[PDB]
């Protein structure tokens, strides 16, 4: 009579997963190559999607961890004495100002919580509560946003969590310091409702539920067939 404590919901949907890896420079390049942006949604990591889409309604907090590693890029007039690098990590709640470039005014808002992290210490951590207007996130939504039966099917619903933007703080006159960002996302205190059958056909779109017709299982030689093989001899095979 064995215990059932590793199959529970909390121990099944509370494993940190790397859901985003990005790279951004510091001095040169086009402005869009000077920051890293990610929209929080559980619809692009196929493993995490398949584990979440096993239920219909979910209610959880968010614990997010950022891992940043930076180097010095090859070139001429390279830096020799840059003391340290300090990064800014910005959480943009739904319905909040969003920067469109580096050095934009929106980086200095008083409503977006920001973390200033100097490189070398432990990674920066943050936790966001259940930010929604409804009472639970819905993975599957059968309907439209507008009441006139027109719009986008199962999209632009209340399941909005926010954006995350990472940028450099140190202005670099000599050299360029390329950096890489890894995001680790975990739920806490998760509650799940209305279980569903696991999916069968591979995912094709990051926003739809579209699919190709796939066979129900793998082939077999015969209906009344088990392992026990036959070796081919003087008999009829």
């Amino acid at each position: 009579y064995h215990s059932r404590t590793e199959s529970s919901i909390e121990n099944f949907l509370c494993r940190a997963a790397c859901v985003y890896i990005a790279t951004y420079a510091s001095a040169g390049g086009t402005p869009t190559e000077r920051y890293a942006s990610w929209r929080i949604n559980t619809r692009q990591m196929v493993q995490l999607r398949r584990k979440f889409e096993l239920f219909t309604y979910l209610r959880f907090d968010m614990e997010i961890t950022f891992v940043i590693t930076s180097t010095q890029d090859p070139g001429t007039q390279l830096a020799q004495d840059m003391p340290v690098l300090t990064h800014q990590i910005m959480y943009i709640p739904p319905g909040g100002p969003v920067p469109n470039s580096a050095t934009d005014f929106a980086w200095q808002s008083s409503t977006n919580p920001s973390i200033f992290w100097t490189e070398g210490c432990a990674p920066a951590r943050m936790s966001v509560p259940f930010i929604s207007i409804g009472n639970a996130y819905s993975n599957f939504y059968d309907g439209w946003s507008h009441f006139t039966q027109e719009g986008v099917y199962g999209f632009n619903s209340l399941n909005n969590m926010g954006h995350i933007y990472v940028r450099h703080v140190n202005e670099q006159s000599l050299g360029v310091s390329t950096s890489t960002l890894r995001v680790y996302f975990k739920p806490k205190h998760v509650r799940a409702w209305v279980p569903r059958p696991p999916r069968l056909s591979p995912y094709v779109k990051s926003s739809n539920v579209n699919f190709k017709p796939t066979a129900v299982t793998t082939e077999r030689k015969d209906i009344n067939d088990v392992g026990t093989l036959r070796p081919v001899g003087y008999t009829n095979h």
Partner: antibody
Amino acid sequence: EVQLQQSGPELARPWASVKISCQAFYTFSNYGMQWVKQSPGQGLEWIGPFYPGNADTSYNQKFKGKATLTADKSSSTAYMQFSSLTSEDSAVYYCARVVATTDFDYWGQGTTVTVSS
Amino acid sequence: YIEASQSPSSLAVSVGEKVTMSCKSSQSLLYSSNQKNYLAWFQQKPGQSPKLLIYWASTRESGVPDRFTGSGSGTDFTLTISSVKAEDLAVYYCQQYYSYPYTFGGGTKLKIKR
């Protein structure tokens, strides 16, 4: 140490039947012969044997409904009939023959059947 | 079906060293009624006809030197060459003659390292 020979390489075309013969230099009592598919990308794949002294003719299941086999023991000639010839069926056909019940001791020569559409 | 996987890569060693390699099968290859392992060790000269070296995975073919020795029971099937040579440049197949489909292995070429 006995050799084994067969029809010969013809440069065929798609939708042109290619019957591959094969002679023999042993007896026809419970011994058998088969063929292999020499392709660099597809490795080696058998196609289908027939067993003199057993009246058992078998084919590969990827080629089921495509290839057949017909031969006469008194003729000592082993055809390998093939249908729906595509462009990728090119291979160096070895006529392997075995006097053991199940082995691959003896082998053929090789024939090129590369086609051009 | 019933198949087997060849060694991941070639020997890639210098000439003159005894080599031990393996061939993993995707299903059992022993007839415990006869205690028979239905598998043989193959070789094909590039440009010429193939020829096996060890059949039944326990006895070398008559006319083949003693250096090539195949062994193994169950799913695994190994082989040992007491002395690799530059005049055996060919592809080694670990083929199972259990039943049709008479599928082959993957092949083991002797590349150049000297």
